[PDB]
Amino acid sequence: KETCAAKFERQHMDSSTSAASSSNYCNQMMKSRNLTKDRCKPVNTFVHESLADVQAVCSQKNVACKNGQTNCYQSYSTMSITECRETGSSKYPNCAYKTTQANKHIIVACEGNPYVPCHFDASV
């Protein structure tokens, strides 16, 4: 139903906005991007940069992934991101999230040819 690359865009990109638009941003985006369809995905990051600027990271600093493979890349500088984390009270099917705006490096796992982001590993 989706390539890794398209899934990454749906789960992690929001180039339209420079930052989260309200404290309810994560509630709205986790629902609209289909991340609460089957379960409340507990953690998710959105990146407020252009697709070209995030794709560029696959040519930046190579680092180990959390799974121990080494197809991860850390951006040389920091990016506007919004981190979403499900609240302690959230229960499917009324999934609820805290929204945190931040400016941090991103680490992404890259795959394919063209070699592009497919997983969001971490922010730092």
Side-chain angles (χ1 to χ4, degrees):
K1 58 180 186 176
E2 206 166 21
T3 67
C4 67
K7 176 169 183 178
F8 179 94
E9 290 173 18
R10 172 172 57 88
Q11 298 195 114
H12 302 296
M13 290 295 307
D14 186 8
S15 311
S16 72
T17 54
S18 290
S21 46
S22 74
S23 70
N24 240 52
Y25 175 88
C26 286
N27 285 329
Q28 293 162 184
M29 291 285 293
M30 298 295 285
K31 177 165 191 295
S32 68
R33 298 299 186 82
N34 226 4
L35 304 171
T36 62
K37 185 170 82 182
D38 293 315
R39 62 186 206 109
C40 303
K41 180 179 185 186
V43 296
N44 191 67
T45 298
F46 294 101
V47 184
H48 302 287
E49 304 288 352
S50 72
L51 182 65
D53 284 354
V54 177
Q55 291 174 334
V57 176
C58 295
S59 67
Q60 305 176 16
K61 183 65 177 170
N62 186 221
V63 295
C65 304
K66 283 169 185 189
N67 74 3
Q69 287 302 130
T70 65
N71 61 315
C72 279
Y73 293 81
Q74 179 169 324
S75 63
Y76 295 130
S77 194
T78 62
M79 289 193 178
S80 174
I81 66 174
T82 301
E83 301 178 287
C84 302
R85 178 155 302 235
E86 183 175 21
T87 73
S89 69
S90 174
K91 296 182 178 56
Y92 182 95
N94 299 282
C95 301
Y97 289 92
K98 173 85 173 58
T99 297
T100 297
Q101 180 52 45
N103 200 290
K104 288 179 183 184
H105 305 270
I106 62 169
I107 302 181
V108 294
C110 298
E111 300 180 23
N113 179 17
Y115 196 53
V116 293
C118 293
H119 304 287
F120 190 96
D121 186 274
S123 60
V124 172

PDB file of all heavy atoms in Angstrom, residues 61-92:
ATOM      1  N   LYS A  61      26.285  12.851   8.176  1.00  0.00           N
ATOM      2  CA  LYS A  61      27.188  12.091   9.010  1.00  0.00           C
ATOM      3  C   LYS A  61      26.694  10.657   9.247  1.00  0.00           C
ATOM      4  O   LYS A  61      25.656  10.459   9.874  1.00  0.00           O
ATOM      5  CB  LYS A  61      27.318  12.753  10.376  1.00  0.00           C
ATOM      6  CG  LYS A  61      28.308  12.028  11.258  1.00  0.00           C
ATOM      7  CD  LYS A  61      29.734  12.125  10.679  1.00  0.00           C
ATOM      8  CE  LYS A  61      30.719  11.467  11.569  1.00  0.00           C
ATOM      9  NZ  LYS A  61      32.063  11.359  10.869  1.00  0.00           N
ATOM     10  N   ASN A  62      27.442   9.654   8.778  1.00  0.00           N
ATOM     11  CA  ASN A  62      27.025   8.253   8.962  1.00  0.00           C
ATOM     12  C   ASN A  62      27.224   7.846  10.408  1.00  0.00           C
ATOM     13  O   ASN A  62      28.322   8.069  10.964  1.00  0.00           O
ATOM     14  CB  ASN A  62      27.779   7.335   8.021  1.00  0.00           C
ATOM     15  CG  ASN A  62      27.310   5.925   8.063  1.00  0.00           C
ATOM     16  OD1 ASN A  62      28.149   5.070   8.033  1.00  0.00           O
ATOM     17  ND2 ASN A  62      26.048   5.651   8.023  1.00  0.00           N
ATOM     18  N   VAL A  63      26.203   7.249  11.013  1.00  0.00           N
ATOM     19  CA  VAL A  63      26.273   6.820  12.399  1.00  0.00           C
ATOM     20  C   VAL A  63      25.544   5.510  12.497  1.00  0.00           C
ATOM     21  O   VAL A  63      24.794   5.086  11.584  1.00  0.00           O
ATOM     22  CB  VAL A  63      25.591   7.845  13.411  1.00  0.00           C
ATOM     23  CG1 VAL A  63      26.342   9.166  13.429  1.00  0.00           C
ATOM     24  CG2 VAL A  63      24.081   8.001  13.082  1.00  0.00           C
ATOM     25  N   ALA A  64      25.746   4.805  13.617  1.00  0.00           N
ATOM     26  CA  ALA A  64      25.035   3.540  13.846  1.00  0.00           C
ATOM     27  C   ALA A  64      23.555   3.857  14.104  1.00  0.00           C
ATOM     28  O   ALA A  64      23.176   4.898  14.691  1.00  0.00           O
ATOM     29  CB  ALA A  64      25.608   2.767  15.030  1.00  0.00           C
ATOM     30  N   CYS A  65      22.699   2.935  13.649  1.00  0.00           N
ATOM     31  CA  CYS A  65      21.306   2.944  14.027  1.00  0.00           C
ATOM     32  C   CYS A  65      21.061   2.326  15.367  1.00  0.00           C
ATOM     33  O   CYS A  65      21.845   1.551  15.843  1.00  0.00           O
ATOM     34  CB  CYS A  65      20.413   2.190  13.013  1.00  0.00           C
ATOM     35  SG  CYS A  65      20.551   2.817  11.317  1.00  0.00           S
ATOM     36  N   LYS A  66      19.930   2.611  15.976  1.00  0.00           N
ATOM     37  CA  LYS A  66      19.606   1.935  17.233  1.00  0.00           C
ATOM     38  C   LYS A  66      19.561   0.421  17.133  1.00  0.00           C
ATOM     39  O   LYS A  66      19.735  -0.231  18.142  1.00  0.00           O
ATOM     40  CB  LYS A  66      18.245   2.341  17.678  1.00  0.00           C
ATOM     41  CG  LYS A  66      18.434   3.700  18.243  1.00  0.00           C
ATOM     42  CD  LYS A  66      17.163   4.453  18.534  1.00  0.00           C
ATOM     43  CE  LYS A  66      17.486   5.876  18.997  1.00  0.00           C
ATOM     44  NZ  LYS A  66      16.123   6.409  19.457  1.00  0.00           N
ATOM     45  N   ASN A  67      19.226  -0.127  15.969  1.00  0.00           N
ATOM     46  CA  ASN A  67      19.199  -1.583  15.740  1.00  0.00           C
ATOM     47  C   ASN A  67      20.602  -2.171  15.470  1.00  0.00           C
ATOM     48  O   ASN A  67      20.788  -3.385  15.263  1.00  0.00           O
ATOM     49  CB  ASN A  67      18.170  -1.896  14.596  1.00  0.00           C
ATOM     50  CG  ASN A  67      18.673  -1.504  13.180  1.00  0.00           C
ATOM     51  OD1 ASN A  67      19.788  -1.059  13.021  1.00  0.00           O
ATOM     52  ND2 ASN A  67      17.822  -1.651  12.133  1.00  0.00           N
ATOM     53  N   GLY A  68      21.603  -1.307  15.540  1.00  0.00           N
ATOM     54  CA  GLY A  68      23.020  -1.707  15.256  1.00  0.00           C
ATOM     55  C   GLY A  68      23.465  -1.738  13.792  1.00  0.00           C
ATOM     56  O   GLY A  68      24.667  -1.917  13.538  1.00  0.00           O
ATOM     57  N   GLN A  69      22.547  -1.580  12.812  1.00  0.00           N
ATOM     58  CA  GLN A  69      23.012  -1.437  11.426  1.00  0.00           C
ATOM     59  C   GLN A  69      23.630  -0.066  11.276  1.00  0.00           C
ATOM     60  O   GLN A  69      23.533   0.716  12.190  1.00  0.00           O
ATOM     61  CB  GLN A  69      21.865  -1.583  10.401  1.00  0.00           C
ATOM     62  CG  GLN A  69      21.369  -3.032  10.239  1.00  0.00           C
ATOM     63  CD  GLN A  69      22.406  -4.144   9.787  1.00  0.00           C
ATOM     64  OE1 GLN A  69      22.510  -5.236  10.436  1.00  0.00           O
ATOM     65  NE2 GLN A  69      23.134  -3.901   8.698  1.00  0.00           N
ATOM     66  N   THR A  70      24.293   0.222  10.161  1.00  0.00           N
ATOM     67  CA  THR A  70      25.009   1.515  10.071  1.00  0.00           C
ATOM     68  C   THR A  70      24.558   2.276   8.844  1.00  0.00           C
ATOM     69  O   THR A  70      25.283   3.090   8.302  1.00  0.00           O
ATOM     70  CB  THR A  70      26.548   1.380  10.108  1.00  0.00           C
ATOM     71  OG1 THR A  70      26.942   0.662   8.925  1.00  0.00           O
ATOM     72  CG2 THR A  70      26.992   0.656  11.294  1.00  0.00           C
ATOM     73  N   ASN A  71      23.278   2.141   8.501  1.00  0.00           N
ATOM     74  CA  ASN A  71      22.718   2.965   7.418  1.00  0.00           C
ATOM     75  C   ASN A  71      21.936   4.187   7.973  1.00  0.00           C
ATOM     76  O   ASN A  71      20.987   4.628   7.363  1.00  0.00           O
ATOM     77  CB  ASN A  71      21.795   2.171   6.459  1.00  0.00           C
ATOM     78  CG  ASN A  71      20.558   1.571   7.167  1.00  0.00           C
ATOM     79  OD1 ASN A  71      20.692   1.007   8.243  1.00  0.00           O
ATOM     80  ND2 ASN A  71      19.369   1.704   6.583  1.00  0.00           N
ATOM     81  N   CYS A  72      22.375   4.695   9.129  1.00  0.00           N
ATOM     82  CA  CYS A  72      21.750   5.899   9.720  1.00  0.00           C
ATOM     83  C   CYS A  72      22.638   7.104   9.436  1.00  0.00           C
ATOM     84  O   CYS A  72      23.880   6.977   9.373  1.00  0.00           O
ATOM     85  CB  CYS A  72      21.426   5.754  11.216  1.00  0.00           C
ATOM     86  SG  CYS A  72      19.901   4.881  11.467  1.00  0.00           S
ATOM     87  N   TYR A  73      22.022   8.260   9.417  1.00  0.00           N
ATOM     88  CA  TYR A  73      22.731   9.520   9.140  1.00  0.00           C
ATOM     89  C   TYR A  73      22.230  10.595  10.026  1.00  0.00           C
ATOM     90  O   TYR A  73      20.981  10.745  10.152  1.00  0.00           O
ATOM     91  CB  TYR A  73      22.501   9.932   7.641  1.00  0.00           C
ATOM     92  CG  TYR A  73      23.176   8.928   6.759  1.00  0.00           C
ATOM     93  CD1 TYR A  73      22.539   7.683   6.465  1.00  0.00           C
ATOM     94  CD2 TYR A  73      24.499   9.144   6.265  1.00  0.00           C
ATOM     95  CE1 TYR A  73      23.155   6.711   5.683  1.00  0.00           C
ATOM     96  CE2 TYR A  73      25.113   8.153   5.486  1.00  0.00           C
ATOM     97  CZ  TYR A  73      24.441   6.976   5.251  1.00  0.00           C
ATOM     98  OH  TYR A  73      25.033   6.003   4.482  1.00  0.00           O
ATOM     99  N   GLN A  74      23.149  11.370  10.613  1.00  0.00           N
ATOM    100  CA  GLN A  74      22.815  12.473  11.483  1.00  0.00           C
ATOM    101  C   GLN A  74      23.011  13.760  10.684  1.00  0.00           C
ATOM    102  O   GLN A  74      24.049  13.971  10.029  1.00  0.00           O
ATOM    103  CB  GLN A  74      23.654  12.462  12.718  1.00  0.00           C
ATOM    104  CG  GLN A  74      23.364  13.624  13.649  1.00  0.00           C
ATOM    105  CD  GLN A  74      23.997  13.488  15.006  1.00  0.00           C
ATOM    106  OE1 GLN A  74      24.102  12.394  15.552  1.00  0.00           O
ATOM    107  NE2 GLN A  74      24.266  14.619  15.634  1.00  0.00           N
ATOM    108  N   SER A  75      22.046  14.660  10.770  1.00  0.00           N
ATOM    109  CA  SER A  75      22.169  15.943  10.105  1.00  0.00           C
ATOM    110  C   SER A  75      23.306  16.748  10.784  1.00  0.00           C
ATOM    111  O   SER A  75      23.622  16.680  12.003  1.00  0.00           O
ATOM    112  CB  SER A  75      20.821  16.678  10.222  1.00  0.00           C
ATOM    113  OG  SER A  75      20.470  16.972  11.548  1.00  0.00           O
ATOM    114  N   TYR A  76      24.056  17.460   9.922  1.00  0.00           N
ATOM    115  CA  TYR A  76      25.160  18.309  10.445  1.00  0.00           C
ATOM    116  C   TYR A  76      24.742  19.442  11.374  1.00  0.00           C
ATOM    117  O   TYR A  76      25.447  19.794  12.312  1.00  0.00           O
ATOM    118  CB  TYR A  76      26.029  18.937   9.354  1.00  0.00           C
ATOM    119  CG  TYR A  76      26.784  17.843   8.552  1.00  0.00           C
ATOM    120  CD1 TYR A  76      26.752  17.850   7.155  1.00  0.00           C
ATOM    121  CD2 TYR A  76      27.606  16.865   9.183  1.00  0.00           C
ATOM    122  CE1 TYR A  76      27.491  16.938   6.393  1.00  0.00           C
ATOM    123  CE2 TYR A  76      28.398  15.926   8.365  1.00  0.00           C
ATOM    124  CZ  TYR A  76      28.249  15.997   7.003  1.00  0.00           C
ATOM    125  OH  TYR A  76      28.977  15.129   6.170  1.00  0.00           O
ATOM    126  N   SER A  77      23.578  19.965  11.106  1.00  0.00           N
ATOM    127  CA  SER A  77      23.002  20.978  12.003  1.00  0.00           C
ATOM    128  C   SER A  77      21.601  20.624  12.412  1.00  0.00           C
ATOM    129  O   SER A  77      21.041  19.562  12.081  1.00  0.00           O
ATOM    130  CB  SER A  77      23.147  22.386  11.401  1.00  0.00           C
ATOM    131  OG  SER A  77      22.903  23.469  12.359  1.00  0.00           O
ATOM    132  N   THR A  78      20.977  21.552  13.090  1.00  0.00           N
ATOM    133  CA  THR A  78      19.709  21.278  13.691  1.00  0.00           C
ATOM    134  C   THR A  78      18.569  21.722  12.777  1.00  0.00           C
ATOM    135  O   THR A  78      18.752  22.465  11.814  1.00  0.00           O
ATOM    136  CB  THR A  78      19.651  21.969  15.115  1.00  0.00           C
ATOM    137  OG1 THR A  78      19.772  23.367  14.963  1.00  0.00           O
ATOM    138  CG2 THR A  78      20.711  21.413  16.043  1.00  0.00           C
ATOM    139  N   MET A  79      17.393  21.139  13.034  1.00  0.00           N
ATOM    140  CA  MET A  79      16.187  21.304  12.206  1.00  0.00           C
ATOM    141  C   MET A  79      15.007  21.558  13.155  1.00  0.00           C
ATOM    142  O   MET A  79      15.013  21.089  14.298  1.00  0.00           O
ATOM    143  CB  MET A  79      15.929  19.989  11.433  1.00  0.00           C
ATOM    144  CG  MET A  79      16.997  19.798  10.346  1.00  0.00           C
ATOM    145  SD  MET A  79      16.428  18.474   9.265  1.00  0.00           S
ATOM    146  CE  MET A  79      17.760  18.421   7.997  1.00  0.00           C
ATOM    147  N   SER A  80      14.005  22.301  12.696  1.00  0.00           N
ATOM    148  CA  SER A  80      12.757  22.450  13.437  1.00  0.00           C
ATOM    149  C   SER A  80      11.974  21.149  13.381  1.00  0.00           C
ATOM    150  O   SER A  80      11.697  20.646  12.285  1.00  0.00           O
ATOM    151  CB  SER A  80      11.962  23.564  12.758  1.00  0.00           C
ATOM    152  OG  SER A  80      10.698  23.585  13.424  1.00  0.00           O
ATOM    153  N   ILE A  81      11.632  20.623  14.543  1.00  0.00           N
ATOM    154  CA  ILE A  81      10.861  19.388  14.581  1.00  0.00           C
ATOM    155  C   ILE A  81       9.783  19.517  15.635  1.00  0.00           C
ATOM    156  O   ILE A  81       9.837  20.365  16.550  1.00  0.00           O
ATOM    157  CB  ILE A  81      11.779  18.177  14.946  1.00  0.00           C
ATOM    158  CG1 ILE A  81      12.327  18.263  16.338  1.00  0.00           C
ATOM    159  CG2 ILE A  81      12.899  18.002  13.887  1.00  0.00           C
ATOM    160  CD1 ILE A  81      13.124  17.084  16.857  1.00  0.00           C
ATOM    161  N   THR A  82       8.786  18.664  15.543  1.00  0.00           N
ATOM    162  CA  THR A  82       7.790  18.549  16.623  1.00  0.00           C
ATOM    163  C   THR A  82       7.788  17.103  17.054  1.00  0.00           C
ATOM    164  O   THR A  82       7.619  16.191  16.227  1.00  0.00           O
ATOM    165  CB  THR A  82       6.397  18.926  16.162  1.00  0.00           C
ATOM    166  OG1 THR A  82       6.397  20.268  15.685  1.00  0.00           O
ATOM    167  CG2 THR A  82       5.396  18.793  17.296  1.00  0.00           C
ATOM    168  N   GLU A  83       8.003  16.852  18.328  1.00  0.00           N
ATOM    169  CA  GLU A  83       7.988  15.539  18.916  1.00  0.00           C
ATOM    170  C   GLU A  83       6.626  15.290  19.561  1.00  0.00           C
ATOM    171  O   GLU A  83       6.120  16.108  20.343  1.00  0.00           O
ATOM    172  CB  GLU A  83       9.133  15.462  19.937  1.00  0.00           C
ATOM    173  CG  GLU A  83      10.446  15.727  19.263  1.00  0.00           C
ATOM    174  CD  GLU A  83      11.684  15.738  20.148  1.00  0.00           C
ATOM    175  OE1 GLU A  83      11.903  16.676  20.919  1.00  0.00           O
ATOM    176  OE2 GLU A  83      12.451  14.766  20.071  1.00  0.00           O
ATOM    177  N   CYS A  84       6.021  14.179  19.208  1.00  0.00           N
ATOM    178  CA  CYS A  84       4.733  13.762  19.778  1.00  0.00           C
ATOM    179  C   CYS A  84       4.915  12.563  20.666  1.00  0.00           C
ATOM    180  O   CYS A  84       5.600  11.557  20.294  1.00  0.00           O
ATOM    181  CB  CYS A  84       3.803  13.402  18.642  1.00  0.00           C
ATOM    182  SG  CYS A  84       3.475  14.729  17.410  1.00  0.00           S
ATOM    183  N   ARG A  85       4.316  12.579  21.831  1.00  0.00           N
ATOM    184  CA  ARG A  85       4.396  11.419  22.720  1.00  0.00           C
ATOM    185  C   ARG A  85       3.045  11.233  23.348  1.00  0.00           C
ATOM    186  O   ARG A  85       2.430  12.182  23.849  1.00  0.00           O
ATOM    187  CB  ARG A  85       5.424  11.679  23.830  1.00  0.00           C
ATOM    188  CG  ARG A  85       5.445  10.448  24.795  1.00  0.00           C
ATOM    189  CD  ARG A  85       6.606  10.239  25.498  1.00  0.00           C
ATOM    190  NE  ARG A  85       7.806  10.052  24.753  1.00  0.00           N
ATOM    191  CZ  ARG A  85       8.609   8.979  24.883  1.00  0.00           C
ATOM    192  NH1 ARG A  85       8.199   7.882  25.554  1.00  0.00           N
ATOM    193  NH2 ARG A  85       9.789   8.960  24.277  1.00  0.00           N
ATOM    194  N   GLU A  86       2.544  10.013  23.334  1.00  0.00           N
ATOM    195  CA  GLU A  86       1.216   9.715  23.869  1.00  0.00           C
ATOM    196  C   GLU A  86       1.274  10.004  25.380  1.00  0.00           C
ATOM    197  O   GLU A  86       2.240   9.732  26.066  1.00  0.00           O
ATOM    198  CB  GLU A  86       1.016   8.246  23.637  1.00  0.00           C
ATOM    199  CG  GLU A  86      -0.253   7.773  24.028  1.00  0.00           C
ATOM    200  CD  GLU A  86      -0.501   6.325  23.696  1.00  0.00           C
ATOM    201  OE1 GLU A  86       0.478   5.552  23.501  1.00  0.00           O
ATOM    202  OE2 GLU A  86      -1.694   5.997  23.716  1.00  0.00           O
ATOM    203  N   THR A  87       0.175  10.579  25.850  1.00  0.00           N
ATOM    204  CA  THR A  87       0.037  10.827  27.266  1.00  0.00           C
ATOM    205  C   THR A  87      -0.197   9.550  28.086  1.00  0.00           C
ATOM    206  O   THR A  87      -0.512   8.513  27.544  1.00  0.00           O
ATOM    207  CB  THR A  87      -1.133  11.801  27.508  1.00  0.00           C
ATOM    208  OG1 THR A  87      -2.348  11.087  27.272  1.00  0.00           O
ATOM    209  CG2 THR A  87      -1.067  13.098  26.634  1.00  0.00           C
ATOM    210  N   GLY A  88       0.039   9.666  29.394  1.00  0.00           N
ATOM    211  CA  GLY A  88      -0.098   8.540  30.256  1.00  0.00           C
ATOM    212  C   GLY A  88      -1.516   8.066  30.357  1.00  0.00           C
ATOM    213  O   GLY A  88      -1.736   6.867  30.644  1.00  0.00           O
ATOM    214  N   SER A  89      -2.468   8.945  30.102  1.00  0.00           N
ATOM    215  CA  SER A  89      -3.859   8.550  30.156  1.00  0.00           C
ATOM    216  C   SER A  89      -4.440   8.131  28.846  1.00  0.00           C
ATOM    217  O   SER A  89      -5.552   7.659  28.818  1.00  0.00           O
ATOM    218  CB  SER A  89      -4.586   9.647  30.800  1.00  0.00           C
ATOM    219  OG  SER A  89      -4.614  10.760  29.965  1.00  0.00           O
ATOM    220  N   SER A  90      -3.728   8.314  27.746  1.00  0.00           N
ATOM    221  CA  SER A  90      -4.317   8.040  26.460  1.00  0.00           C
ATOM    222  C   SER A  90      -4.707   6.558  26.330  1.00  0.00           C
ATOM    223  O   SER A  90      -3.913   5.659  26.655  1.00  0.00           O
ATOM    224  CB  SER A  90      -3.245   8.324  25.420  1.00  0.00           C
ATOM    225  OG  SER A  90      -3.590   7.975  24.091  1.00  0.00           O
ATOM    226  N   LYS A  91      -5.895   6.335  25.790  1.00  0.00           N
ATOM    227  CA  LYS A  91      -6.336   4.974  25.522  1.00  0.00           C
ATOM    228  C   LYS A  91      -7.043   4.978  24.155  1.00  0.00           C
ATOM    229  O   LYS A  91      -7.968   5.769  23.860  1.00  0.00           O
ATOM    230  CB  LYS A  91      -7.283   4.473  26.616  1.00  0.00           C
ATOM    231  CG  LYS A  91      -6.609   4.378  27.973  1.00  0.00           C
ATOM    232  CD  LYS A  91      -7.518   3.828  29.092  1.00  0.00           C
ATOM    233  CE  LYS A  91      -6.734   3.723  30.421  1.00  0.00           C
ATOM    234  NZ  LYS A  91      -6.065   5.024  30.922  1.00  0.00           N
ATOM    235  N   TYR A  92      -6.604   4.108  23.276  1.00  0.00           N
ATOM    236  CA  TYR A  92      -7.273   3.852  21.995  1.00  0.00           C
ATOM    237  C   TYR A  92      -8.742   3.525  22.317  1.00  0.00           C
ATOM    238  O   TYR A  92      -8.997   2.778  23.228  1.00  0.00           O
ATOM    239  CB  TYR A  92      -6.599   2.685  21.300  1.00  0.00           C
ATOM    240  CG  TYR A  92      -7.134   2.329  19.947  1.00  0.00           C
ATOM    241  CD1 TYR A  92      -6.503   2.873  18.798  1.00  0.00           C
ATOM    242  CD2 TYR A  92      -8.192   1.436  19.771  1.00  0.00           C
ATOM    243  CE1 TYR A  92      -6.890   2.488  17.563  1.00  0.00           C
ATOM    244  CE2 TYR A  92      -8.628   1.095  18.522  1.00  0.00           C
ATOM    245  CZ  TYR A  92      -8.002   1.607  17.424  1.00  0.00           C
ATOM    246  OH  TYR A  92      -8.371   1.210  16.176  1.00  0.00           O
TER     247      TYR A  92
END
